[PDB]
Design a protein around this motif. Structure first.
Motif, PDB file in Angstrom:
ATOM      1  N   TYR A   5     -31.189 -79.485   8.003  1.00  0.00           N
ATOM      2  CA  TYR A   5     -30.640 -78.807   9.173  1.00  0.00           C
ATOM      3  C   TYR A   5     -30.153 -79.802  10.226  1.00  0.00           C
ATOM      4  CZ  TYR A   5     -30.835 -76.122  13.584  1.00  0.00           C
ATOM      5  OH  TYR A   5     -30.569 -75.567  14.817  1.00  0.00           O
ATOM      6  N   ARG A   6     -30.996 -80.778  10.584  1.00  0.00           N
ATOM      7  CA  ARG A   6     -30.588 -81.797  11.553  1.00  0.00           C
ATOM      8  C   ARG A   6     -29.387 -82.619  11.090  1.00  0.00           C
ATOM      9  NH1 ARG A   6     -34.646 -83.955  11.007  1.00  0.00           N
ATOM     10  NH2 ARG A   6     -33.974 -85.803   9.826  1.00  0.00           N
ATOM     11  N   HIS A  15     -40.304 -82.310   4.608  1.00  0.00           N
ATOM     12  CA  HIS A  15     -39.564 -81.746   5.730  1.00  0.00           C
ATOM     13  C   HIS A  15     -38.121 -81.436   5.360  1.00  0.00           C
ATOM     14  CE1 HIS A  15     -40.019 -80.518   9.791  1.00  0.00           C
ATOM     15  NE2 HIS A  15     -39.190 -81.400  10.320  1.00  0.00           N
ATOM     16  N   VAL A  16     -37.798 -81.430   4.066  1.00  0.00           N
ATOM     17  CA  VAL A  16     -36.411 -81.485   3.611  1.00  0.00           C
ATOM     18  C   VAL A  16     -35.571 -80.456   4.351  1.00  0.00           C
ATOM     19  CG1 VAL A  16     -34.922 -81.209   1.615  1.00  0.00           C
ATOM     20  CG2 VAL A  16     -37.068 -82.417   1.378  1.00  0.00           C
ATOM     21  N   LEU A  38     -27.005 -81.969   8.754  1.00  0.00           N
ATOM     22  CA  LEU A  38     -25.790 -81.330   8.273  1.00  0.00           C
ATOM     23  C   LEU A  38     -25.255 -80.249   9.195  1.00  0.00           C
ATOM     24  CD1 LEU A  38     -26.770 -81.093   4.483  1.00  0.00           C
ATOM     25  CD2 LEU A  38     -25.136 -82.671   5.563  1.00  0.00           C
ATOM     26  N   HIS A  39     -26.106 -79.582   9.981  1.00  0.00           N
ATOM     27  CA  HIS A  39     -25.673 -78.343  10.615  1.00  0.00           C
ATOM     28  C   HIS A  39     -24.562 -78.585  11.632  1.00  0.00           C
ATOM     29  CE1 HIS A  39     -27.807 -79.459  14.292  1.00  0.00           C
ATOM     30  NE2 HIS A  39     -27.288 -78.389  14.865  1.00  0.00           N
ATOM     31  N   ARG A  40     -24.362 -79.835  12.058  1.00  0.00           N
ATOM     32  CA  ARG A  40     -23.231 -80.212  12.898  1.00  0.00           C
ATOM     33  C   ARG A  40     -22.107 -80.887  12.128  1.00  0.00           C
ATOM     34  NH1 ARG A  40     -25.646 -83.695  14.088  1.00  0.00           N
ATOM     35  NH2 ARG A  40     -27.875 -83.236  14.327  1.00  0.00           N
ATOM     36  N   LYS A  41     -22.309 -81.181  10.850  1.00  0.00           N
ATOM     37  CA  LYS A  41     -21.246 -81.743  10.030  1.00  0.00           C
ATOM     38  C   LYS A  41     -20.098 -80.750   9.895  1.00  0.00           C
ATOM     39  CE  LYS A  41     -23.183 -85.699   9.384  1.00  0.00           C
ATOM     40  NZ  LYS A  41     -24.141 -85.398  10.491  1.00  0.00           N
ATOM     41  N   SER A  42     -18.903 -81.281   9.682  1.00  0.00           N
ATOM     42  CA  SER A  42     -17.738 -80.442   9.482  1.00  0.00           C
ATOM     43  C   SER A  42     -17.724 -79.855   8.074  1.00  0.00           C
ATOM     44  CB  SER A  42     -16.470 -81.253   9.720  1.00  0.00           C
ATOM     45  OG  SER A  42     -16.309 -82.240   8.720  1.00  0.00           O
ATOM     46  N   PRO A  43     -16.977 -78.767   7.875  1.00  0.00           N
ATOM     47  CA  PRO A  43     -16.766 -78.253   6.512  1.00  0.00           C
ATOM     48  C   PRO A  43     -16.222 -79.283   5.539  1.00  0.00           C
ATOM     49  CG  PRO A  43     -16.000 -76.676   8.136  1.00  0.00           C
ATOM     50  CD  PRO A  43     -16.301 -77.932   8.884  1.00  0.00           C
ATOM     51  N   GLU A  44     -15.290 -80.130   5.972  1.00  0.00           N
ATOM     52  CA  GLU A  44     -14.760 -81.140   5.063  1.00  0.00           C
ATOM     53  C   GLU A  44     -15.769 -82.244   4.774  1.00  0.00           C
ATOM     54  OE1 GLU A  44     -12.749 -78.374   6.145  1.00  0.00           O
ATOM     55  OE2 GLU A  44     -12.035 -79.474   4.394  1.00  0.00           O
ATOM     56  N   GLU A  45     -16.700 -82.517   5.690  1.00  0.00           N
ATOM     57  CA  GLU A  45     -17.779 -83.439   5.350  1.00  0.00           C
ATOM     58  C   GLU A  45     -18.788 -82.798   4.404  1.00  0.00           C
ATOM     59  OE1 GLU A  45     -18.323 -83.996   9.410  1.00  0.00           O
ATOM     60  OE2 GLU A  45     -17.994 -86.166   9.412  1.00  0.00           O
ATOM     61  N   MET A  46     -19.054 -81.501   4.572  1.00  0.00           N
ATOM     62  CA  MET A  46     -19.860 -80.781   3.593  1.00  0.00           C
ATOM     63  C   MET A  46     -19.214 -80.773   2.220  1.00  0.00           C
ATOM     64  SD  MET A  46     -22.615 -79.936   4.941  1.00  0.00           S
ATOM     65  CE  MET A  46     -23.060 -79.058   3.442  1.00  0.00           C
TER      66      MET A  46
END
Lengths: 446, 127
Positions: free
Chosen positions: A378-379, A372-373, A381-389
């Motif tokens: 998506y679940r 399911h990677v 990371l897609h709400r993570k901030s750019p600095e957390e990415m």
């Protein structure tokens, strides 16, 4: 009056005797504390300056100056310092004066033996005197001193000759002196700017002569690797290129020099080096190019230059570790066809690191199941901030054994770049013509 | 900051510079009006060998529309109508115009440029 002039003179004789063990920093702190008394300070400094001028039996101090020469530091006949000992007496006196700048003597001295801003004029004249003008160390110390004090025409000429002739720290202290003096008076500003320009024109004229020898010898080399001897006087660490560039960097620092006979022959020289099928052969003109782009491309002619020498300026930048957006060649950020791909890639990676240099980056886990990677990512990371990415992602696959995180990340990224093009997500579809490329799927509204 | 790259260079930044087996490309080249021993073609192979990896990749992208190298080799080079080999066509128009590409056929139309230097300059300016 804590101490008299005979006790101060007894202390000052310690500056002449060169003993390594003697703690001269402690002696400097003693003189500094004594010099809180204004009259003591003034007599101490007037004596130290008489010692510098005189550098340019109890007092029987034999200093080893050279081989087979053990001089007496004092010649009493009116007291003279034997010129072999002088450079050490100068070095200790300038060492003391640097602390006093952070914060009769002879007749008293023989009476024993028988038993900030005003003297700046003397210290600027001191640059002319030979024992100092010889020694790069004494020049560096005296320039550090002037750079502290700075916080007339000949005295500025003597400060500038320190640049037209030969110390990177000493010449950066000369830059500090010449700036902080120019901050003083508009008239010293003007006289020092115009005399810098005079020296830079001398340097430019002889640099055009030198490059003319280089070009002529490249002609005579081809018309029948590059170790043209005309190149030696450009390779030199003390080359007129480095003097000219130094002076121009100070001129441009004072701005807040007409030489097309230099610039067009730097031109044909660069063109004849590039046509001569050698590459690093350009780098012997890199500082003249950086001077060209200093005098031009003020905070056009530089654009035609970067076109007709494009691959040359790229060889320059590719060889240089100077970071493209902090050096002089930053202006060409916006005219980008004039750089190589890997030059632009380096600029990218360094300027990106410059903008994100304030961010402390951590490691950060991403927990996914092998089947399911895509949706787990998506679940997560897609709400993570750019600095957390921007944190370094490490991937944990449920129940699998530990393995190298770098190889596991490369595999994970590969799997993602595949799953991106599974039609089941409807994100990307192949061009019906090519059938190997991919563009946004217009059927992703499903 | 990304806008410093070209449209070629962004692909080469994301997917990396490929290693081009020029012997495989030559083995998968079709000559239509040029020949494999035409002087402009010997100049072509000399030029493409002299171009660095980035200008070679930019050429492959220019003529095929991608930097992607077929895993099986250029024998498996796909086009609009199935496996299409790379191909060089002589452009019989005036030789003061750039080479031109039709990537869905992987097709190069190439004017008969009079010299190595001029052909290299025109190709390098195109790519």
């Amino acid at each position: 009056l804590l101490l008299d002039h005979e006790a101060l003179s007894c202390l000052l004789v310690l500056l002449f005797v060169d003993e390594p063990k003697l703690n001269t920093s402690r002696l400097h702190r003693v003189l500094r504390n004594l010099c809180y008394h204004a009259q003591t300070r003034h007599w101490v400094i007037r004596s130290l300056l008489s010692i510098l001028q005189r550098s340019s039996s109890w007092l029987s101090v034999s200093m080893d100056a050279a081989l087979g020469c053990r001089t007496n530091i004092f010649q009493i006949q009116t007291v003279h310092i034997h010129p072999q000992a002088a450079p050490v007496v100068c070095r200790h006196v300038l060492d003391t004066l640097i602390q006093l700048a952070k914060v009769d003597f002879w007749d008293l001295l023989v009476k024993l033996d028988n038993m900030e801003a005003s003297p700046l004029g003397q210290l600027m004249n001191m640059l002319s005197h030979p024992v100092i003008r010889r020694s790069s160390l004494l020049t560096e110390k005296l320039l550090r001193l002037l750079s502290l004090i700075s916080i007339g025409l000949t005295e500025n000429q003597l400060q500038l000759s320190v640049e037209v002739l030969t110390s990177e720290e000493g010449l950066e202290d000369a830059a500090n002196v010449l700036l902080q003096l120019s901050r003083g008076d508009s008239g010293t500003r003007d006289t020092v700017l115009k005399l810098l320009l005079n020296g830079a024109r001398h340097l430019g004229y002889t640099l055009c002569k030198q490059i003319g020898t280089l070009l002529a010898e490249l002609r005579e080399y081809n018309l029948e690797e590059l170790q043209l001897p005309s190149m030696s006087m450009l390779t030199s660490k003390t080359s007129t290129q480095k003097f000219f560039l130094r002076v121009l960097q100070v001129i441009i620092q004072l701005r807040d020099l007409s030489l097309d006979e230099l610039w067009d022959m730097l031109g044909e020289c660069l063109k004849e080096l590039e046509e001569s099928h050698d590459q690093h052969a350009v780098l012997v003109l890199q500082p003249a190019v950086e001077a060209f782009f200093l005098v031009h491309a003020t905070e056009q002619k530089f654009l035609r230059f970067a076109e007709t020498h494009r691959t040359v300026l790229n060889q320059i930048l590719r060889q240089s570790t100077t970071h493209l957006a902090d050096g002089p060649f930053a202006v060409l950020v916006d005219y980008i066809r004039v750089l190589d791909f890997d030059v632009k890639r380096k600029y990218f990676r360094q300027e990106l690191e410059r903008l994100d240099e304030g961010l402390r980056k951590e490691d950060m886990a991403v927990h996914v199941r092998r089947d399911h990677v895509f949706e787990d990512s998506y679940r997560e990371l897609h709400r993570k901030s750019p600095e957390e990415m921007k944190n370094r992602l490490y991937i944990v696959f449920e129940g699998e054994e530990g393995q190298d995180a770098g190889g596991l990340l490369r595999e994970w990224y590969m799997i993602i770049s595949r799953e991106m093009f599974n039609p089941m997500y409807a994100l990307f579809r192949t061009s019906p013509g090519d059938r190997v490329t991919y563009t946004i799927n217009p059927s992703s509204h499903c | 900051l990304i806008s410093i790259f070209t449209e070629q260079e962004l692909e080469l930044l994301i997917s990396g510079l490929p290693t081009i087996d020029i012997d495989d490309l030559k083995s998968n080249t079709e000559y239509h009006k040029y020949q494999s021993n035409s002087i402009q073609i010997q100049w072509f192979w000399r030029a493409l060998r002299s171009f660095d990896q980035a200008d070679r990749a930019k050429f492959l992208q220019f003529v095929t529309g991608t930097s992607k190298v077929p895993l099986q080799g250029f024998a498996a080079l796909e086009g609009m109508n199935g496996i299409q080999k790379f191909q060089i066509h002589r452009d019989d128009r005036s030789t003061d115009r750039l080479p031109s590409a039709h990537t869905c056929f992987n097709q190069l139309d190439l004017p008969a440029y009079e010299s190595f230097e001029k052909l290299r300059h025109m190709l390098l300016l195109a790519i």
